[PDB]
Write an enzyme that holds these catalytic residues in place. Sequence first.
Site, mmCIF file in Angstrom:
data_model
loop_
_atom_site.group_PDB
_atom_site.id
_atom_site.type_symbol
_atom_site.label_atom_id
_atom_site.label_comp_id
_atom_site.label_asym_id
_atom_site.label_seq_id
_atom_site.Cartn_x
_atom_site.Cartn_y
_atom_site.Cartn_z
ATOM 1 N N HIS A 41 0.815 -1.220 0.000
ATOM 2 C CA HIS A 41 0.000 0.000 0.000
ATOM 3 C C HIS A 41 0.846 1.267 0.000
ATOM 4 O O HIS A 41 0.284 2.337 -0.174
ATOM 5 C CB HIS A 41 -1.079 0.034 1.101
ATOM 6 C CG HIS A 41 -0.596 0.338 2.491
ATOM 7 N ND1 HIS A 41 -0.607 -0.628 3.481
ATOM 8 C CD2 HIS A 41 -0.169 1.502 3.030
ATOM 9 C CE1 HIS A 41 -0.151 -0.038 4.574
ATOM 10 N NE2 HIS A 41 0.136 1.241 4.350
ATOM 11 N N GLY A 143 2.015 6.089 9.670
ATOM 12 C CA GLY A 143 3.458 6.080 9.455
ATOM 13 C C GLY A 143 4.158 4.852 10.030
ATOM 14 O O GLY A 143 5.335 4.616 9.743
ATOM 15 N N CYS A 145 3.263 1.685 9.381
ATOM 16 C CA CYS A 145 3.180 0.562 8.459
ATOM 17 C C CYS A 145 4.567 0.153 7.977
ATOM 18 O O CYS A 145 5.450 1.005 7.822
ATOM 19 C CB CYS A 145 2.212 0.858 7.314
ATOM 20 S SG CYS A 145 0.513 1.190 7.867
#
EC number: 3.4.19.12
Lengths: 304, 304
Positions: A41, A143, A145
């Site tokens: 993503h 942030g 991830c």
Amino acid sequence: SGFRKMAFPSGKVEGCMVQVTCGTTTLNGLWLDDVVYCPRHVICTSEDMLNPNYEDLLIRKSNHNFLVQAGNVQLRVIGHSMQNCVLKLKVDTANPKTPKYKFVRIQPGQTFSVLACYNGSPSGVYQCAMRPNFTIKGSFLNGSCGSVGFNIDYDCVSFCYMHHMELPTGVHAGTDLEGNFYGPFVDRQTAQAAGTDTTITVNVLAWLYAAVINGDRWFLNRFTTTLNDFNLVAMKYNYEPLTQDHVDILGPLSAQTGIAVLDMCASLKELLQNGMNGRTILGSALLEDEFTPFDVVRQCSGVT
Amino acid sequence: SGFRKMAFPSGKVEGCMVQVTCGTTTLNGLWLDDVVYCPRHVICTSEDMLNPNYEDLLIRKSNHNFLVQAGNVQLRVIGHSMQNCVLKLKVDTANPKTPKYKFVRIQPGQTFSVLACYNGSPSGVYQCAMRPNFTIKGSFLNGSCGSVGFNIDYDCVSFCYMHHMELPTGVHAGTDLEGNFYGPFVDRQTAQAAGTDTTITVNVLAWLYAAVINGDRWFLNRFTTTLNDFNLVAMKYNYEPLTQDHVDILGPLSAQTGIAVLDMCASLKELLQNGMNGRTILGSALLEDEFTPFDVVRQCSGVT
Ligand SMILES: Cc1ccncc1NC(=O)[C@H]1CCC12CCC2
Ligand SMILES: Cc1ccncc1NC(=O)[C@H]1CCC12CCC2
């Protein structure tokens, strides 16, 4: 003596954390050998995340669009590929700090340490358990991830989790290091149900053994039970049914303390049916399920 | 979202851990620049520890008797000195992994991460608080002495604690990095009382603010209180008296949530007088006091 929710020393994993930027999205990457692993993503804008077509979105990206920065220095991307829900960016430099490592898929109920990161930088480490419903109750902000979960056997780091998503309910979802989601989750900004979670029975029993070892014995009683009787109570209180495999893993703790596993289940049964009556066990006022039998033996013996 | 008992990333401290042997005693040392810091009781045999005369015991030791091993390689000891309860061994090599560091004496109520070690090797990391009675409720076995507590401000490691002793009550005692004990403790195998401990009020209030931020709001009420009224309740439940300095530090959390500090005290007052009524706050069934207002702001904002 004493018993803490202990995380593994995060050093070997800190040396692998990088920042990955693609367009306007920045998240964390895991640099092992000449490959950077991050959630796919990273290629999405907030608008894309409603119903992203990852194959199509990746087709508009080239190696030069993936900005990988390790601390302060820039890594050169020579290849990119999508494997399930992770992107694998081939870089021209092998990470000099690559520890001995394995990619493993943990079972629900197993525990691991998470090194929470933002913009490639580590902020903290904590120990958590993979819930029976495949979610983790972590601490993750926008942030985070790409932050990873791991276990350590002497010098080898077994990577087991990569953070991808926060469910509408505030619980966390992610993948193994091959991009396979734990649970039924998809990397999409859609409502997704985490199934009914349960308490990890074997871990609660392991934690009751850690309490006896450390001196908290008030919960010990004169009773015993059978696997059938205990499991009837476990089902009533939304606990995982205890099996002979669970009893076998509790063997070393049962041997060290001299308290038969079914006797410990009888203590757990009375705690489930009566509560704590305002008392605590290892500084906790509820039944702790985030220590496996292996975690307890390790902490109680000093395995480094 | 989510809120965890988070420890600092332990990497910078792992690179400083060494093993120190003197005679038959082995413990952990902290290698910073060309100096190794460890507890002075490394020079004692179990028999000596009853009433040790440290100046006399050190007089029978030479630089060659202190065996310092960093991972696998041996360090050459060119000097030794006693500073309060720590030994400072001058080595001929500056540690290449010495991070930017400070030696600080923390206040009671402040928190820090402990990197537990055995034979110079790290086994785990956990976050804990220095109790108002100067003890720490750690997880320490025989061989853990010399393990250190620290805080991290971006790239600087502030060392605040070194583990020395386990009290007969299973709680832990240690020094700052200048060998000064926190509390009235002495490095001697004698019964020593840890004074009456209290709950760190400002940290409980900070943790109540972290719960509101994360969604646990059931404890919020229609009431308010005064510092005088609250402190009467705090004294009854063995809580630290709240001061205007504590209220001022809670300022940022009060501003972010829009809940006045005295209003949060009224919620805490009703929880102290009524209990949790079988509910939980941030997965805890008791009032958590091991997060300072600074820890909450950091975790809730993503400071790396
Ligand atoms: C805001 C946040 C905080 C912590 N962890 C994760 C998130 N957010 C997400 O999960 C979003 C970013 C794109 C996403 C993946 C599925 C849709
Ligand atoms: C057995 C143990 C476990 C954890 N921490 C510490 C200890 N033990 C001690 O404190 C002993 C070793 C010499 C000593 C210092 C005062 C007397």
